[PDB]
Design a protein around this ligand. Structure first.
Ligand SMILES: *[C@@H]1O[C@H](CO)[C@@H](O[C@@H]2O[C@H](CO)[C@@H](O)[C@H](O)[C@H]2NC(C)=O)[C@H](O)[C@H]1NC(C)=O
Ligand SMILES: *[C@@H]1O[C@H](CO)[C@@H](O)[C@H](O)[C@H]1NC(C)=O
Ligand SMILES: *[C@@H]1O[C@H](CO)[C@@H](O)[C@H](O)[C@H]1NC(C)=O
Ligand SMILES: *[C@@H]1O[C@H](CO)[C@@H](O)[C@H](O)[C@H]1NC(C)=O
Ligand SMILES: *[C@H]1O[C@H](CO)[C@@H](O)[C@H](O)[C@H]1NC(C)=O
Length: 461
């Protein structure tokens, strides 16, 4: 009974956290908490369904929060079976009340629900990987169809540092589920930065859409949630439904609905403590650019400047090679090892006290994650001191008339980011060519913070 379009929802949830204790709570108390969160999510699910939604994603850790060790978490966990068990928790019919409730919300509102809860998998002592305390504990995405049937279960593969209360699956779980409105894949938060499963789902299973529960700490200039999540969508050419936690206190905010060509809806709010429901109609099999050769253009030309005054700047603990942008227009090129970044630009006007720089990085990131990068970035320097180029910067005043950025990337996996002052996306104000140029389509609707090509060489990790 296939459909050409569908309405997506994502909910940015202000989580109710458990009270702290020095000793593990009872299963009855842990449920109490989870139900209070569930009461809220029910609000979002009811509303979204009442607005035509076919699926809704809720965030990671949205039901019990993120402050845990292995034991304090345990009473919140449930044993979550393989969808292949072929089971509708609402109907049948106890020891899995969270799953029952989720299944009922999906059924009573006739809507796919996607949530993050915790799975426990008690293991045998024969299993050499079995933890001393007798069980695996996984961070677990679950999906329920509009019948309430469990159709997907993904265990998070790439844990962030601090997630000591969870285990890493022995093997990467490549999890999909199909619908009348397309083929979906799923992964969680920090997974987006790695090859398994996120890349494989797209490259090898050809999913139309990704659902993506998350709790994401915003790190400028390149990893604000909305900024990076939408760029991934665009780079991998998929619909992308990012449901983030709302917790400004920890720089967590940035949910949205992204299509290959543009953001469709986004929310970023650091000023209040209320959550947010987003909606947008999408195409089941979404329209996208044909395959991009990212090095094609940048390798066909000679350097746009030389005798450069280059310098080192620290962008998120990585040492880039920069060059100041002097004119109100200009063309520059900057290299580092195998990467050459080419920028042509023209500003709307020169804001006197705002410096921009074009930067190149080719190397291994190591802080709070070990992964290999290649990056071209135009960015606004925090201050007029060039030692601050690469440091986090909230706001700007310099609009741009045009830009065109490209690099000699040795990866086919590059993600085009653009971010405007006050952490605003620039939907449909740019596009990517077949040969790897990221170029403006018009004058920017606001001041620019960065325009970046975020490359990623998964093998060199
Ligand atoms: C619906 O999704 C299923 C996955 O359940 C798709 O089947 C996979 O297709 C990929 C890519 O063609 C194959 O490499 C896999 O072998 C298939 N599944 C598995 C589990 O390995 C199916 O193509 C989708 N339905 C369509 C296109 O109508
Ligand atoms: C949901 O559906 C079940 C089906 O039996 C119904 O009995 C229950 O009262 C409903 N609960 C909610 C929260 O809608
Ligand atoms: C991209 O273009 C370059 C020439 O600029 C070529 O050598 C390279 O093989 C191309 N890559 C692909 C995947 O077509
Ligand atoms: C470089 O920029 C100048 C203006 O600064 C422009 O006229 C020229 O055509 C550009 N060359 C390119 C993009 O190769
Ligand atoms: C935690 O929960 C109890 C009720 O279960 C509430 O009355 C109390 O105020 C809360 N504790 C703190 C420190 O806020």
């Amino acid at each position: 009974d296939k459909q050409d379009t569908f309405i997506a929802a994502v909910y940015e949830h202000a989580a109710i956290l458990p009270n702290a204790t020095l000793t593990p709570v009872s299963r009855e108390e842990a449920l109490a908490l989870m139900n209070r969160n569930l009461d809220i999510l029910e609000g979002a699910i009811t509303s979204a369904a009442d607005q035509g939604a076919h699926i809704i994603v809720t965030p990671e850790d949205a039901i019990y929060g993120w402050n845990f060790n292995r034991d304090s978490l345990y009473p919140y966990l449930e044993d979550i079976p393989d969808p292949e068990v072929n089971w509708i928790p609402c109907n049948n019919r106890g020891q899995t009340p969270v799953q029952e409730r989720l299944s009922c919300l999906a059924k009573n509102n006739s809507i796919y629900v996607v949530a993050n809860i915790g799975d426990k998998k008690p293991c045998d002592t024969s299993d050499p990987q079995c933890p001393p305390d007798g069980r695996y504990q996984y961070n677990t995405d679950v999906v329920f169809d509009s019948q309430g049937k469990l159709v997907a279960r993904y265990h998070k593969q790439n844990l962030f540092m601090g997630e000591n209360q969870f285990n890493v699956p022995k093997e990467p779980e490549i999890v999909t589920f199909n619908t009348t409105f397309g083929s979906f894949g799923i992964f969680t938060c920090f997974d987006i930065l790695f090859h398994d499963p996120a890349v494989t789902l797209v490259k090898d299973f050809h999913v139309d859409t990704i659902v993506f529960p998350t709790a994401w700490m915003n790190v400028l200039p390149h990893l604000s949630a909305v900024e990076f999540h939408s760029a991934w969508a665009m780079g991998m050419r998929v619909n992308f439904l990012a449901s983030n936690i709302h917790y400004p206190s920890k720089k967590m905010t940035g949910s949205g609905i992204y299509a290959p060509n543009s953001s469709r809806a986004f929310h970023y709010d650091m000023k209040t403590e209320e959550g947010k429901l987003l909606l947008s109609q999408l195409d089941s099999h979404p329209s996208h650019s044909a395959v991009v050769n990212w090095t094609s253009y940048a390798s066909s030309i000679e350097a746009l400047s030389s005798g450069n005054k280059e310098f080192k700047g620290t962008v998120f603990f990585d040492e880039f090679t920069f060059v100041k942008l002097t004119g109100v227009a200009g063309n520059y090129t900057v290299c580092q090892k195998d990467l050459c970044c080419h920028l042509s630009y023209k500003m709307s006007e020169n804001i006197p006290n705002e410096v921009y720089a074009l930067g190149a990085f080719d190397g291994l990131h190591t802080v709070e994650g070990r992964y290999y990068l290649q990056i071209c970035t135009l960015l606004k320097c925090k201050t007029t001191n060039l030692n601050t180029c690469g440091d986090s910067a909230e706001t700007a005043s310099t609009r741009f008339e045009m830009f065109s950025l490209s690099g000699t990337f040795g990866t086919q996996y590059v993600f085009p980011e653009v971010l405007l002052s006050e952490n605003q996306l620039a939907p449909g104000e740019f596009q990517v060519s077949t040969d790897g140029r990221l170029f403006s389509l018009k004058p920017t609707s606001g001041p620019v913070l960065t325009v970046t090509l975020f490359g990623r060489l998964y093998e060199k990790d």
